[PDB]
Amino acid sequence: MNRQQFIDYAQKKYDTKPDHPWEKFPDYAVFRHSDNDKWYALLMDIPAEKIGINGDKRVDVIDLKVQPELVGSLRKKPGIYPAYHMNKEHWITVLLNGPLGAKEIHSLIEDSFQLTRLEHHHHHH
């Protein structure tokens, strides 16, 4: 899967525009819904050695939010490495330059989308 596809896909399904809070990182892109509040989606190129792969070539990865019980299912698939941040089950690093298929990624995102749905609750009774 190429980044151009990810950027066009997000603007197509998430209709969200890229953001870069840190100017020292213009190549970094962050997607978030201000109408949903609470989310995590960042795309950045990190060394292949930072994902556990021996290769020293740089690769493109994106943050994927999943449920604590579906982490084993998604994390079981190869090419997907766990987040190196403080969390792990909440956010999972996915290798776009990996063996992951475009249709396979779309299915996984659909599952994460359910958690990024707008208006989680709003009813007096």
Helices and strands, counts by H and E, the chain: 3, 5
Number of domains in the chain: 1
Q: What are phi and psi of 123, to 5 degrees?
A: -160, 125
Rounded Cα gap, residues 71 and 67, in angstroms: 6
Q: How far apart are CA 101 and CA 18, in angstroms?
A: 23
Neighbours of 7 (CB within 10 A): 15
Domain residues for the domain of 108 are 1-125
CA 123 vs CA 111, 112, 119: distances in Å: 25, 24, 10
Query: 70-75 long-range contacts, Cβ below 8 Å, gap at least 24?
Result: 70/111, 74/108, 74/111
Method used to solve the structure = NMR
Letter string b/e over residues 58-81, b meaning 16 or more CB atoms within 10 A of that residue's CB? ebbbbbbbbeeeebeebeeeebbb
The CATH number of whichever domain residue 10 belongs to comes to: 3.90.1150.30
